[PDB]
Amino acid sequence: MIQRTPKIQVYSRHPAENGKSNFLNCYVSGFHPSDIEVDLLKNGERIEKVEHSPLSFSKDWSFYLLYYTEFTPTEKDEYACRVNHVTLSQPKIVKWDR
């Protein structure tokens, strides 16, 4: 039996340009077990309406998740990924570093 804490990377698909449409990713990698919750936050509020399913796979004992949503960066909007997992004593919030 193992427990492995996820690595969490938050990044835009392309170089961010204020007012230009883009995608914000959340790659959550190398975790075990597979049960997990991953949300995108905008100004501290949970993004609810995501069109695309996440891409999920295991290799083979680690799990991987790519969660992405369309967005248009602005100067004033702050984004963060929030992850909860058994390996975390409280939810982990990782800010998008633009």
The token duo for 28 is 């959550």
Integer CA distances (angstroms), 80 to 32, 38, 56, in order: 22, 11, 20
Residues in the chain: 98
1-98 has CATH 2.60.40.10 classification: yes
Please report, for the chain, the start and end positions of each structural domain, with discontinuous segments joined by +.
1-98
* DSSP track, 66-80: EEEEEE---SS--EE
- Name residues whose C-beta falls within 8 Å of residue 40's C-beta, 6 or more positions apart in sequence: 24, 26, 46, 47, 50, 67, 69, 79, 80, 81, 82
**Spatial separation of the C-alpha atoms in residues 71 and 60, rounded to whole Å:** 32
* Interruptions in the chain after residues (C–N over 2.5 Å): none
Closest to 24 measured CA to CA, from 68, 66, 73: 68
| Resolved by | X-ray
- Name residues whose C-beta falls within 8 Å of residue 37's C-beta, 6 or more positions apart in sequence: 83, 84, 85
Answer yes or no: are the C-beta atoms of 22 and 11 closer than 8 Å.
Answer: no
